[PDB]
Amino acid sequence: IPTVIETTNERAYDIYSRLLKDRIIMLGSQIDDNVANSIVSQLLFLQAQDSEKDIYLYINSPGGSVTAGFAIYDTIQHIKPDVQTICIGMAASMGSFLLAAGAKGKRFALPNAEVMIHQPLGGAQGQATEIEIAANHILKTREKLNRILSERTGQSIEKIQKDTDRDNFLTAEEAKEYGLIDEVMVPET
Amino acid sequence: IPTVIETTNERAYDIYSRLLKDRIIMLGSQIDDNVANSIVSQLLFLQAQDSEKDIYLYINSPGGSVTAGFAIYDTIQHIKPDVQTICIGMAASMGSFLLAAGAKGKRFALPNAEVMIHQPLGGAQGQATEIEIAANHILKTREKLNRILSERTGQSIEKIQKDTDRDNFLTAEEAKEYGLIDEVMVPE
Amino acid sequence: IPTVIEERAYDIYSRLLKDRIIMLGSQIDDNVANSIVSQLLFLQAQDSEKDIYLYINSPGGSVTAGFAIYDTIQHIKPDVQTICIGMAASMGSFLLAAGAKGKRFALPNAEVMIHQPLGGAQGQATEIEIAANHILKTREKLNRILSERTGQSIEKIQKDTDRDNFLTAEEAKEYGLIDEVMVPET
Amino acid sequence: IPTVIEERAYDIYSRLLKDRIIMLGSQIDDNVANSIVSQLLFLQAQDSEKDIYLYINSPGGSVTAGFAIYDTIQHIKPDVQTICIGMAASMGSFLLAAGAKGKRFALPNAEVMIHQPLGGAQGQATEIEIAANHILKTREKLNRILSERTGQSIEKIQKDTDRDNFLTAEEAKEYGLIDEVMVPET
Amino acid sequence: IPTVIETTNRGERAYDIYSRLLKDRIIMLGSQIDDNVANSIVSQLLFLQAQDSEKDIYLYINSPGGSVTAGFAIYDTIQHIKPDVQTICIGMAASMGSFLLAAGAKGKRFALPNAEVMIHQPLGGAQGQATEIEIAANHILKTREKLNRILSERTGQSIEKIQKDTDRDNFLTAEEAKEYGLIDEVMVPET
Amino acid sequence: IPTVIERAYDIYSRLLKDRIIMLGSQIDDNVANSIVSQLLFLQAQDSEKDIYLYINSPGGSVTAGFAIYDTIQHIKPDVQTICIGMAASMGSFLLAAGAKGKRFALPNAEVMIHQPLGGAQGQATEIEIAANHILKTREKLNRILSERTGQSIEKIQKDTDRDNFLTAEEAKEYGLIDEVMVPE
Amino acid sequence: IPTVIETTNRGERAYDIYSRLLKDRIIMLGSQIDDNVANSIVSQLLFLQAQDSEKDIYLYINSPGGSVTAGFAIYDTIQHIKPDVQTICIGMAASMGSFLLAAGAKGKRFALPNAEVMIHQPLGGAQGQATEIEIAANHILKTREKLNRILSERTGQSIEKIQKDTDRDNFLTAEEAKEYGLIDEVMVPET
Amino acid sequence: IPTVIETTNRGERAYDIYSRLLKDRIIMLGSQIDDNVANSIVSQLLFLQAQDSEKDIYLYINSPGGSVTAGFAIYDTIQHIKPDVQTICIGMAASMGSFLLAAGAKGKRFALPNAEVMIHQPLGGAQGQATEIEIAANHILKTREKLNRILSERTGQSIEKIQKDTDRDNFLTAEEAKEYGLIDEVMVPE
Amino acid sequence: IPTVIETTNRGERAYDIYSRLLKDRIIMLGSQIDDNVANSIVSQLLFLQAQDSEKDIYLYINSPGGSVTAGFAIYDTIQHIKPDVQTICIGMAASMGSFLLAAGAKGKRFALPNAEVMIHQPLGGAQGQATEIEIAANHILKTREKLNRILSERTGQSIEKIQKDTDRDNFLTAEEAKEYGLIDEVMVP
Ligand SMILES: CC(C)C[C@H]1C(=O)N(Cc2cccc3ccccc23)C[C@@H]2N(C(=O)NCc3ccccc3)CCC(=O)N21
Ligand SMILES: CC(C)C[C@H]1C(=O)N(Cc2cccc3ccccc23)C[C@@H]2N(C(=O)NCc3ccccc3)CCC(=O)N21
Ligand SMILES: CC(C)C[C@H]1C(=O)N(Cc2cccc3ccccc23)C[C@@H]2N(C(=O)NCc3ccccc3)CCC(=O)N21
Ligand SMILES: CC(C)C[C@H]1C(=O)N(Cc2cccc3ccccc23)C[C@@H]2N(C(=O)NCc3ccccc3)CCC(=O)N21
Ligand SMILES: CC(C)C[C@H]1C(=O)N(Cc2cccc3ccccc23)C[C@@H]2N(C(=O)NCc3ccccc3)CCC(=O)N21
Ligand SMILES: CC(C)C[C@H]1C(=O)N(Cc2cccc3ccccc23)C[C@@H]2N(C(=O)NCc3ccccc3)CCC(=O)N21
Ligand SMILES: CC(C)C[C@H]1C(=O)N(Cc2cccc3ccccc23)C[C@@H]2N(C(=O)NCc3ccccc3)CCC(=O)N21
Ligand SMILES: CC(C)C[C@H]1C(=O)N(Cc2cccc3ccccc23)C[C@@H]2N(C(=O)NCc3ccccc3)CCC(=O)N21
Ligand SMILES: CC(C)C[C@H]1C(=O)N(Cc2cccc3ccccc23)C[C@@H]2N(C(=O)NCc3ccccc3)CCC(=O)N21
């Protein structure tokens, strides 16, 4: 991880910390509780710095913990600044959920980025009533995810259910048509 | 596993095979598909030998596969002879279910034998709809087990549900009172 | 595994085989298939008229090994009865359905399950394609034969095998996988 | 593995061997080959006129062990029928094709697969060269014999074995690996 | 990792050797491409643009390749930014590494004389139900078409030729890579 | 392993009744002891009649191989050697050790010859001892192969330096076998 | 392990090949010498004596050696019994295996032409306190003196030569073993 | 890894011992050659050129070799840059390590008296289908020709002799390496 | 590993204890000799020469030995540089460690009273074809002759005596090492 030195009228930054100085947050790995806590803490801090200016959330993630994902989601919605979401490389599972949770009109993906949507994965072991509890829980968390995706894509709950049943790979352009993003970010002129 | 000799007008038997000659079947281990297939085959054979005479099912088992258990259960009910069930040492899970499935009035347990009843155990991993399928399945299998236990003990489905929620250890005497067995087999 | 004696000594499974009963009681692999195939061919040579009884308590297994058993059942002259006791799943329930017309049974609390075939593929994109085309062609093949023997449509079987589908013995009868639920005697 | 009594007692596979049926039902290694070879030589000594039946349900295996079986089949006087049930892949399908002319069969839903031989090489560049030359020479050898026995060209076999190639029984007949699909009575 | 110290009029700065290369707009892609490596490269590229949107960037490539998806994070970011990104293959560029070598700015894709370039199909895996394997197979095949289409655009070779030539591992010399269109020049040694 | 009845025999034991010995696996001390015991027994049964040694082996222990070799040479009967499938390393050595004019291979059988493999670990003088030993055992093997193929020690050394795969026909030309056993 | 059936005037008996050799007073020492192998060989020797105390016994040796203690179980039993025990080295006799080769009856110790004979010191181990290591070291050294003394008696070589010659691994040809006194003759083929 | 502190006119600067050697244009190739080691050495070489394109660079070699590809990253970068790169074998230079020893600037390839130089063929592996093994075999053989050709150019020995001499492991003394042409001089004590 | 601070009147510096010893021209060879340890020691020796080509260097040795090749990297660099390199065995010097102890500047090779010196043959391994084993055996034997020749030169003992004496592990007291010629004096308190 390289270091960059910025000159003034000189401060040293690791490249990711430097991006954070310009209000860019990197969600570039599997989403676990650690990654969520860091992103949450960055979002809260960037608000305290400036509650008006845009934040940029870079997403290259295969997804991960639903619950950790919702830590990030709730914090994005809570804070005053618009949070732009930009999918580069890949956004899958909770990663593509969070891609869709970006501020209205500021959800992007670069041309060859990969977006995937599916159902949540989990597990249950033990007594029949314990398995029932876990099954009811993961199903309730599927309804919750599907409801919010419906709100933010404009697709129906019924269509999202059908389309998330098995792994569903989308192109950037297909993600735009679906409502997961607003624009495909074309290269500059 | 020792060998014994029978005389008459002489054959060598391993001790378990000799018990089988006197219509005694040993269910003495964890119930898996192998054990079930052997017990099923023994039951069918003993019927062909004599469709009138009683069969004796010895049970010292912690239970095991529900499906394999129901292979034994259905075969017991299907055949013409009465199948006595005798719990010695321990009958737990599907083992105690099968103890209760013995012929009416011929379900026994020795004084210090342990009987335990509980819910079926399982597992599910993967997508939400896959976990749903597995959960619906194990719950349907619970209703099925509870319904048959109700029929054979005389207890209500509601009471069996409550009483199987956690592990429930019973004495032989308590098992009699519950309806899982008919008598505690007293000594000379 | 106990021994029974009638002047001749038999292990219990071999004694069942003397009365034309074959035990399919485990995961279906190439060994189990070869044994069952060999038993079926032998029972035909003993008597080509008399019924054979195929006991099924199996979670299924190899599709290819399953089709060894299937083809041999169809090839031989005797009717092969199929009787599901405990559980018949995957290729086990396929073979349950392959029994002679009108002689496919299940006992009351037996469990029947149907689903799609499972497999794997690893390597280059064209290698994965080959494996994917293969498992899909083997799904069509299984679905076609199940359609023929249950009387259900290929389209319905596809829908119904998409995820694991547990059936009661009675539900299996209604579906056409078996002909009768074998009730207890009098 | 069940026992049948005919009084002489036989394990089911040994009984099949009494009727000149040899089971090739597993991965082909040196053990399996040695057993099959020994069975073939014995059956010849019993009767050099009567047909032998080689059952094949194998994913293949050792090329060299395979050629032990192949050479022994060709050497002995009796015709060796080959019958693919379930699956014949790799060296298994090679041996299926090596059966006596006009007596190579497969049951309707049996699976036949052909591909190139698999191997490995590790060490110095000249050691890898030696191993590479060797496996390539053994590919030419296999392809040449398959060409002779199917009637297909060496060039077509090379193209068709490049990647895994799954065939139906009917497709195997058209290809020349077998002479006929063994239909049931109906 | 060696530290070097630079001297100026406002002070001395200490740099790890790689960070010092980054100060001169040189980015090191020198390992298996995973999501971490991609995120770092992307972040470097975005930063170097903000420093100066006119000046060239130099992407050193010694990589066996790796994640296709992580590779496309780097690719899309190269194309998006204003500066030309030079690509220089030293030692080896294979799989997604050679793809990215070809994605350098037109006329500024280089390889040193004894560098190794390899092209092949993407690798993957699938396990489970037949319809799950179908999905994965369709996906990796669509990703092959996507890679082949872009390689066609940037080498000038046809999609049909790239398909044939990537079927199995295909090792190229630097000179062969030039002829193929993966690079523009073999970088000869100086005077 | 199937049983045949004539008196019940496992298939390999039945081959032994007709003086056929199976060398069908990696050569270790167990396999050698069995083969040696079979050879001594078959001599006691009949010291005139031929013995048939089937070979489908990748080779193995040099020392165990020489147990079989010395016993073949010692006994009165001719021991035919027949390579089916594969004969490599000590397996191809033993193929060559068959009675003069009765060394065969079937058409697609594989014969391979190479140097002996080994290992040494510890002090410099311990490695020296092990190196001298494996080199002396190479000379020994090369000398006997020279005697039985008719090739020179120098040519065998060159030809065994790296793995050398031969066809049955090539093995005949080389002198490892006398004939390729054709089908009638 | 194959079965042979011997057909005679009193019967039809079936033998595993090794048991058949034992019927002709041939004992197989064909593996690593541990306590099991020793107990079997001892039991065979005692039985063959009870069968016939006049007739020769034949001890086949193809062994890399092993337990010294187990080896001395075999040695002492050979010396105790009345019959001569011939020893025949085929393939290899090493460590305690070559010791036992030398322990055969005087004039009846053989090796086939390409058999390998090796002699060396006993191997062992010690771990723990200094006085425990001392005990183990004294023990293995006394056991070396014991082996060397008996080898001296049976080869005719001096204790001091055996010590020098067993210091490192010492490989001998059959012919060299004859010259050394470990065997009496190299068994040459018929003619 | 110890730290040394220097005193000058622009400060008092702390260096890890290896970084201090780099300040005097000395690069340490002291481990198995993998892609990391190559990238570091390449980056050091490019930096030392930018510092001063006239002054000599010193490449210390104590390596058993390693990746051929990574080795050629170092080789090509040495040849590309303007400064002479001296090569000095201390302890051991084997496989790609001895190749790089030979790639030093003409007349400035050294080895200390008891240093060990070894040359052999490249090692590799191949697993899978016959055509896959063919591809890998052709590749490692083409890479052998490539290495042999360059060694021929820099030692002055023929391609045929190098092939024969690299067939199995070949250990050389420093003096034998001089005679062979892998180095120019054995560096005697002062 | 503790830190010491040199508090002077001109320049306060912090040093890890080993780096501080290096400031006084003391090099620690205190572990198994591998290529890393050799490269570090070599680099220290070269640096100390550049600092002052007249002043003595002190090489502390507490090592069980290790790589012969790496050992000869250290040996050759000692002999090459202009300063005398003192060698001081404390605790233990074995294998290549005792070789390097003997390679110290004439008259400046020391050992403390209860230090342990051990000499033996080099250890190695060989696996594969007979000709490969031959090559490895010839190599380790040539390397033994090389070590024995240099030990002979620096102890004053004959090559024949060193061969005999290194055949098996040979433990020496400090005093015995002096008598042998591996060191010049036992450093008394
Ligand atoms: C609506 C709150 C934004 C306001 C309230 C509050 O509820 N929290 C709890 C709190 C803790 C962690 C994460 C959260 C995420 C979401 C919501 C709340 C979260 C802390 C917050 N503070 C703050 O933001 N300070 C700004 C700041 C300063 C320095 C670093 C980072 C942020 C401190 C003072 C205060 O009253 N609050
Ligand atoms: C009892 C018959 C009324 C049921 C019917 C049948 O469906 N099967 C299939 C079958 C196979 C395995 C296990 C089963 C368990 C339960 C029910 C069936 C089971 C076998 C049975 N046979 C039989 O008992 N023969 C006598 C016998 C002799 C020796 C051993 C065992 C049984 C063959 C003749 C016949 O019509 N049947
Ligand atoms: C189709 C045969 C019914 C007729 C024909 C044949 O095609 N095979 C091939 C063959 C081999 C193995 C398994 C098969 C499975 C299915 C179809 C074929 C299979 C063997 C068979 N034999 C036989 O049944 N013998 C009777 C027998 C006696 C005792 C045990 C087993 C079988 C030997 C004599 C003979 O001509 N045949
Ligand atoms: C047709 C003969 C000319 C073949 C010839 C021969 O070359 N071998 C070598 C040999 C050994 C093993 C496997 C082989 C496979 C193929 C060819 C050869 C094989 C043995 C064979 N014998 C035989 O068949 N005996 C009959 C028999 C009886 C009982 C069991 C098995 C075989 C013994 C007598 C004899 O001359 N021969
Ligand atoms: C061309 C605009 C669309 C760029 C736009 C934007 O979309 N992002 C998102 C973003 C995040 C990560 C990686 C990306 C890669 C490609 C595109 C976008 C990427 C950040 C960017 N910013 C910036 O460059 N700031 C300057 C800077 C300073 C120091 C380091 C890096 C960047 C912040 C200000 C701003 O409006 N944007
Ligand atoms: C032919 C004699 C020259 C051999 C002589 C001899 O020195 N041995 C030692 C001995 C043991 C093991 C393996 C050997 C292999 C090769 C040579 C020798 C081997 C065995 C042999 N015997 C024998 O053949 N008995 C016949 C027999 C019958 C049945 C089965 C096996 C052997 C016992 C009686 C006897 O004096 N001898
Ligand atoms: C020469 C007598 C001193 C032997 C004496 C004795 O000391 N033992 C102990 C004993 C046991 C095991 C192994 C030994 C090895 C060496 C010495 C002794 C060993 C057993 C022996 N017996 C016997 O040989 N019976 C005959 C026999 C029959 C069948 C098989 C084996 C032996 C029982 C009768 C008897 O008095 N003795
Ligand atoms: C010698 C010029 C002809 C090379 C040319 C070029 O092609 N590269 C690419 C490049 C990158 C990495 C490693 C390489 C290795 C070999 C060849 C090329 C390599 C970098 C170089 N730069 C430079 O040296 N900058 C100075 C510098 C400062 C600090 C440390 C290192 C270098 C940047 C400016 C520039 O145009 N170039
Ligand atoms: C009498 C000349 C032959 C010495 C000459 C040389 O050939 N090397 C190669 C070299 C590299 C690595 C390790 C070695 C170990 C032993 C011998 C040589 C070694 C280094 C030296 N330099 C120097 O000392 N610079 C001063 C310095 C400053 C800081 C730390 C170390 C040294 C660079 C300038 C120079 O011309 N030389």
Side-chain angles (χ1 to χ4, degrees), chain B residues 13 17 33 37-38 41 45 49 67 70-71 73-74 78 127 129-130 137 144, chain C residues 3-6 13 16 23 25 55 57 85-87 109-111 163 166:
Chain B
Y13 285 96
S17 291
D33 284 354
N37 299 334
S38 190
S41 298
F45 170 75
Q49 292 255 101
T67 69
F70 272 115
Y73 176 93
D74 280 343
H78 176 87
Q127 296 188 283
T129 65
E130 291 177 317
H137 179 253
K144 180 172 154 190
Chain C
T3 304
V4 298
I5 130 99
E6 304 240 60
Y13 299 129
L16 266 67
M23 303 297 283
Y55 166 93
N57 182 28
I85 301 180
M87 153 183 66
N109 301 119
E111 219 188 64
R163 311 290 272 242
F166 296 96

Coordinates of all heavy atoms in Angstrom, one line a residue, chain B residues 13 17 33 37-38 41 45 49 67 70-71 73-74 78 127 129-130 137 144, chain C residues 3-6 13 16 23 25 55 57 85-87 109-111 163 166:
Chain B
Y13 N -23.2 -71.4 15.7 CA -23.8 -70.1 15.5 C -23.0 -69.1 16.2 O -22.5 -69.3 17.3 CB -25.2 -70.1 16.2 CG -26.3 -70.9 15.5 CD1 -26.6 -72.2 15.8 CD2 -27.0 -70.2 14.5 CE1 -27.6 -72.8 15.1 CE2 -28.1 -70.9 13.8 CZ -28.4 -72.2 14.1 OH -29.4 -72.9 13.4
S17 N -26.7 -64.6 15.8 CA -27.4 -65.5 14.9 C -28.3 -66.6 15.6 O -29.3 -67.0 15.1 CB -26.5 -66.2 13.9 OG -25.9 -65.3 13.0
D33 N -29.1 -46.6 7.9 CA -29.7 -47.4 6.8 C -29.3 -48.9 6.9 O -30.1 -49.7 6.6 CB -29.4 -46.7 5.4 CG -30.3 -45.5 5.2 OD1 -31.3 -45.1 6.0 OD2 -30.1 -44.9 4.1
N37 N -31.9 -52.0 7.3 CA -32.0 -53.0 6.3 C -31.9 -54.4 6.8 O -32.6 -55.3 6.4 CB -31.0 -52.8 5.2 CG -31.1 -51.5 4.4 OD1 -32.2 -50.9 4.4 ND2 -30.0 -51.0 3.9
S38 N -30.9 -54.6 7.7 CA -30.7 -55.9 8.4 C -31.9 -56.3 9.3 O -32.4 -57.4 9.1 CB -29.4 -55.8 9.3 OG -29.1 -57.1 9.8
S41 N -34.8 -57.1 7.0 CA -34.6 -58.5 6.4 C -34.9 -59.6 7.4 O -35.4 -60.6 7.0 CB -33.2 -58.5 5.8 OG -33.0 -57.6 4.8
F45 N -37.9 -62.4 7.1 CA -37.5 -63.8 7.2 C -38.2 -64.5 8.3 O -38.7 -65.7 8.1 CB -36.0 -63.9 7.4 CG -35.5 -65.3 7.8 CD1 -35.5 -66.3 6.8 CD2 -35.2 -65.6 9.1 CE1 -35.0 -67.6 7.1 CE2 -34.8 -66.9 9.4 CZ -34.7 -67.9 8.4
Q49 N -40.7 -67.9 8.1 CA -40.5 -69.1 9.0 C -41.8 -69.5 9.6 O -42.1 -70.7 9.6 CB -39.5 -68.8 10.0 CG -38.0 -68.6 9.6 CD -37.2 -69.8 9.8 OE1 -36.9 -70.6 8.9 NE2 -36.7 -69.9 11.1
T67 N -35.7 -41.7 8.9 CA -36.1 -42.5 7.7 C -35.8 -44.0 7.9 O -36.6 -44.8 7.5 CB -35.3 -42.0 6.4 OG1 -33.9 -42.4 6.4 CG2 -35.4 -40.6 6.0
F70 N -38.2 -45.4 10.3 CA -39.5 -45.7 9.7 C -39.5 -46.9 8.7 O -40.5 -47.5 8.4 CB -40.1 -44.5 9.0 CG -40.9 -43.6 9.9 CD1 -40.5 -42.3 10.2 CD2 -42.1 -44.0 10.4 CE1 -41.2 -41.5 11.0 CE2 -42.9 -43.2 11.3 CZ -42.4 -41.9 11.6
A71 N -38.3 -47.3 8.3 CA -38.2 -48.6 7.5 C -38.5 -49.8 8.5 O -39.2 -50.7 8.1 CB -36.8 -48.7 7.0
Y73 N -40.1 -49.5 11.5 CA -41.5 -49.3 11.9 C -42.5 -49.9 10.9 O -43.3 -50.8 11.3 CB -41.8 -47.8 12.2 CG -43.3 -47.5 12.5 CD1 -43.7 -47.5 13.9 CD2 -44.2 -47.4 11.6 CE1 -45.0 -47.2 14.2 CE2 -45.6 -47.1 11.9 CZ -45.9 -47.0 13.2 OH -47.2 -46.8 13.6
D74 N -42.5 -49.5 9.7 CA -43.4 -49.9 8.7 C -43.4 -51.5 8.5 O -44.4 -52.1 8.2 CB -43.2 -49.2 7.3 CG -43.8 -47.8 7.2 OD1 -44.7 -47.5 8.1 OD2 -43.4 -47.1 6.3
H78 N -46.4 -54.1 9.1 CA -46.8 -54.8 7.9 C -46.9 -56.3 8.2 O -47.9 -57.0 7.7 CB -45.8 -54.6 6.7 CG -46.1 -55.4 5.5 ND1 -47.0 -55.1 4.6 CD2 -45.6 -56.6 5.1 CE1 -47.1 -56.0 3.6 NE2 -46.2 -57.0 4.0
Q127 N -29.2 -21.3 0.4 CA -30.1 -20.2 0.1 C -31.3 -20.2 1.0 O -31.7 -21.2 1.6 CB -30.6 -20.2 -1.3 CG -29.5 -20.1 -2.4 CD -30.1 -19.9 -3.8 OE1 -30.5 -20.9 -4.4 NE2 -30.1 -18.7 -4.3
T129 N -34.5 -20.1 0.4 CA -35.6 -21.0 -0.1 C -35.2 -22.5 0.2 O -36.1 -23.3 0.4 CB -36.0 -20.8 -1.6 OG1 -35.0 -21.1 -2.5 CG2 -36.5 -19.4 -1.8
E130 N -33.9 -22.8 0.1 CA -33.4 -24.1 0.5 C -33.6 -24.4 2.0 O -34.0 -25.6 2.3 CB -31.9 -24.3 0.1 CG -31.7 -24.3 -1.4 CD -30.2 -24.4 -1.8 OE1 -29.4 -23.7 -1.2 OE2 -29.9 -25.2 -2.8
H137 N -39.7 -29.5 5.8 CA -39.6 -31.0 5.8 C -39.4 -31.5 7.3 O -40.1 -32.4 7.6 CB -38.4 -31.4 5.0 CG -38.2 -32.9 5.0 ND1 -37.1 -33.5 5.6 CD2 -38.9 -33.9 4.5 CE1 -37.2 -34.8 5.5 NE2 -38.3 -35.1 4.8
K144 N -45.6 -35.9 11.9 CA -45.7 -37.3 11.6 C -45.3 -38.2 12.8 O -46.1 -39.2 13.1 CB -44.9 -37.6 10.4 CG -44.9 -39.1 9.9 CD -44.1 -39.1 8.6 CE -43.5 -40.4 8.3 NZ -42.6 -40.3 7.1
Chain C
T3 N -26.5 -64.7 10.4 CA -26.6 -66.0 9.6 C -27.8 -66.7 10.0 O -28.1 -66.9 11.2 CB -25.3 -66.8 9.8 OG1 -24.2 -66.1 9.5 CG2 -25.3 -68.1 8.9
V4 N -28.5 -67.3 9.0 CA -29.7 -68.2 9.2 C -29.4 -69.5 8.6 O -28.7 -69.6 7.5 CB -31.0 -67.6 8.7 CG1 -31.3 -66.3 9.4 CG2 -31.0 -67.4 7.2
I5 N -29.9 -70.5 9.2 CA -29.7 -71.8 8.6 C -30.9 -72.6 8.3 O -31.8 -72.7 9.1 CB -28.6 -72.4 9.5 CG1 -29.1 -73.8 9.9 CG2 -28.4 -71.5 10.6 CD1 -28.7 -75.0 9.2
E6 N -31.0 -73.1 7.1 CA -32.2 -73.8 6.6 C -31.8 -75.2 6.1 O -30.6 -75.4 6.0 CB -33.0 -73.0 5.6 CG -33.3 -71.6 6.0 CD -34.8 -71.3 6.0 OE1 -35.6 -72.1 6.7 OE2 -35.3 -70.4 5.3
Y13 N -29.0 -61.5 3.9 CA -29.2 -60.9 2.6 C -29.2 -61.9 1.5 O -30.0 -61.9 0.5 CB -28.2 -59.7 2.3 CG -28.3 -58.6 3.3 CD1 -27.2 -58.1 3.9 CD2 -29.6 -58.0 3.6 CE1 -27.3 -57.0 4.8 CE2 -29.7 -56.9 4.5 CZ -28.5 -56.4 5.1 OH -28.6 -55.4 6.0
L16 N -32.5 -63.8 1.4 CA -33.5 -63.0 0.7 C -33.3 -63.2 -0.8 O -34.3 -63.3 -1.5 CB -33.5 -61.5 1.1 CG -34.5 -61.1 2.2 CD1 -34.1 -61.7 3.5 CD2 -34.6 -59.6 2.4
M23 N -31.7 -56.3 -2.4 CA -31.6 -55.2 -1.5 C -30.8 -54.0 -2.1 O -29.6 -54.2 -2.3 CB -31.0 -55.6 -0.1 CG -31.7 -56.7 0.6 SD -33.3 -56.3 1.1 CE -33.0 -55.3 2.5
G25 N -30.1 -50.9 -0.6 CA -30.2 -50.3 0.7 C -29.2 -49.3 1.1 O -29.0 -49.0 2.3
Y55 N -36.1 -54.2 -3.2 CA -36.3 -53.3 -2.0 C -35.4 -52.1 -2.1 O -34.3 -52.2 -2.5 CB -35.8 -54.1 -0.8 CG -35.5 -53.4 0.5 CD1 -36.5 -53.3 1.5 CD2 -34.3 -52.8 0.8 CE1 -36.3 -52.6 2.7 CE2 -34.0 -52.1 1.9 CZ -35.0 -52.0 2.9 OH -34.8 -51.4 4.1
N57 N -34.2 -48.7 -0.1 CA -33.9 -47.7 1.0 C -32.6 -47.0 0.7 O -31.6 -47.3 1.3 CB -33.9 -48.4 2.4 CG -33.7 -47.4 3.5 OD1 -34.1 -46.2 3.5 ND2 -33.1 -47.9 4.6
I85 N -39.1 -48.6 1.1 CA -39.2 -48.7 2.6 C -38.2 -47.8 3.2 O -37.0 -47.8 2.9 CB -39.0 -50.2 3.1 CG1 -40.1 -51.1 2.4 CG2 -39.1 -50.3 4.6 CD1 -40.1 -52.6 2.7
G86 N -38.6 -47.0 4.2 CA -37.8 -45.9 4.8 C -37.6 -44.7 3.9 O -38.3 -43.7 4.2
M87 N -36.8 -44.8 2.9 CA -36.6 -43.6 2.0 C -36.1 -44.0 0.6 O -35.3 -44.9 0.4 CB -35.5 -42.8 2.6 CG -34.6 -42.0 1.6 SD -33.3 -41.0 2.3 CE -32.2 -42.3 2.9
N109 N -45.3 -44.9 5.8 CA -44.5 -43.8 6.3 C -43.1 -43.7 5.5 O -42.2 -43.1 6.0 CB -44.2 -44.0 7.8 CG -45.5 -44.0 8.6 OD1 -45.8 -45.0 9.3 ND2 -46.2 -42.9 8.5
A110 N -43.0 -44.3 4.3 CA -41.8 -44.2 3.5 C -41.7 -42.8 2.9 O -42.8 -42.2 2.7 CB -41.7 -45.3 2.5
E111 N -40.5 -42.3 2.7 CA -40.3 -41.0 2.2 C -39.8 -41.1 0.8 O -38.8 -41.8 0.5 CB -39.2 -40.3 3.1 CG -39.4 -38.9 3.4 CD -38.2 -38.3 4.1 OE1 -37.1 -38.2 3.5 OE2 -38.3 -37.9 5.3
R163 N -36.2 -27.8 -7.1 CA -35.6 -27.8 -5.8 C -36.0 -29.1 -5.2 O -36.8 -29.8 -5.8 CB -36.1 -26.6 -5.0 CG -35.9 -25.2 -5.7 CD -34.5 -24.8 -5.9 NE -34.0 -24.0 -4.8 CZ -33.6 -22.8 -4.9 NH1 -34.3 -21.9 -5.6 NH2 -32.6 -22.4 -4.2
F166 N -40.0 -33.2 -1.3 CA -40.4 -34.3 -0.4 C -41.8 -34.7 -0.7 O -42.7 -33.8 -0.7 CB -40.0 -34.1 1.0 CG -38.6 -33.9 1.3 CD1 -38.0 -32.6 1.4 CD2 -37.7 -34.9 1.5 CE1 -36.7 -32.4 1.6 CE2 -36.4 -34.8 1.7 CZ -35.8 -33.5 1.8

